[PDB]
Design a protein around this ligand. Structure first.
Ligand SMILES: Cc1cccc2c1N(C(=O)n1ccnn1)CC2
Length: 267
């Protein structure tokens, strides 16, 4: 199909239970490479790339459709329907956690569980809300993107990934980040980093598992507490002893067992 091709959809493993994995900004489904081997024996696993990822066709990036996160949520619902999936566990990394939340507001019937990795409803600080960024920080980021995309990618990747600045995961993410079209990276970067999902959290009904690294430059720990406090569904938080915004890529020994526990066990 065109949309499974457009999103590089892969379906692997086998189970009576389906799990769908959604990746974050700057990466692609390869971010799940250390998790998938532990899923394929028990679950049917669906991987897909968000439109605008470096692995996707820039001809298909519709700036109108993706000026809002719900454009990505509609892509996810369209993938689920075309695969004839009527129920899945959704695992959402970074922005995909909020995309998964919006999709569950539109179609709560399709999700039995949302497992969030490195999620945030809002990155900019607000009154009695610490998201971790002032508007001037984001403006500096967008200007660096415009000014020299390759230089921005090389400085950003170690900060996003954390840990040793020369690790395999920093190199992987530096590569996928630079492979994004820079005009798409700026537009998506602005859309994501300036988003605000706080208002719809009390209306979620799908149970949510809120996981993050204790040390994450884009997600202060108090964000996980905010999510837990304001999500209207039942939820649970686990702050992992790990560093970085893509911990399932860079620190699998400490992170993958935590993700598996929350996939395999319900609230
Ligand atoms: C890790 C990181 C390091 C330094 C500045 C920033 C990041 N952010 C991200 O990645 N995203 C946030 C949502 N989607 N991606 C937020 C801006």
């Amino acid at each position: 199909g065109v949309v499974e091709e457009a999103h590089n959809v892969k379906v692997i493993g086998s189970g009576e239970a389906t799990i769908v994995l959604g990746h974050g900004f700057g990466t692609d489904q390869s971010v799940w490479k250390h998790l998938v081997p532990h899923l394929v024996d028990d679950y049917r696993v669906v991987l897909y790339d968000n439109m605008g990822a470096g692995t996707t066709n820039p001809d298909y990036f519709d700036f109108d459709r993706y000026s809002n996160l719900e454009g990505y949520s509609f892509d996810l619902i369209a993938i689920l329907e075309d695969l004839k999936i009527e129920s899945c566990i959704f695992v959402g990394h970074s922005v995909s956690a909020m995309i998964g939340v919006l999709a569950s507001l539109n179609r709560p019937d399709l999700f039995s569980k949302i497992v969030m990795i490195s999620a945030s409803p809002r990155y900019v600080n607000d009154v009695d809300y610490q998201g971790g960024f002032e508007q001037e920080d984001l403006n500096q980021l967008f200007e660096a993107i415009r000014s020299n995309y390759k230089a921005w990618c090389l400085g950003f990747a170690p900060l996003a990934v954390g840990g040793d600045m020369d690790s395999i995961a920093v190199q992987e993410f530096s590569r996928t980040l630079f492979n994004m079209r820079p005009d798409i990276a700026l537009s998506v970067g602005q859309t994501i980093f300036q988003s605000d999902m706080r208002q719809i959290l009390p209306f979620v009904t799908v149970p949510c598992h809120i996981l993050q690294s204790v040390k994450d430059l884009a997600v202060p720990v108090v964000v996980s507490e905010y999510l837990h406090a304001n999500l209207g569904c039942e939820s649970v938080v686990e702050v992992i002893p790990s560093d970085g915004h893509l911990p399932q890529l860079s620190s699998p020994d400490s992170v993958i067992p935590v993700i598996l526990r929350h996939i395999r066990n319900d609230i």
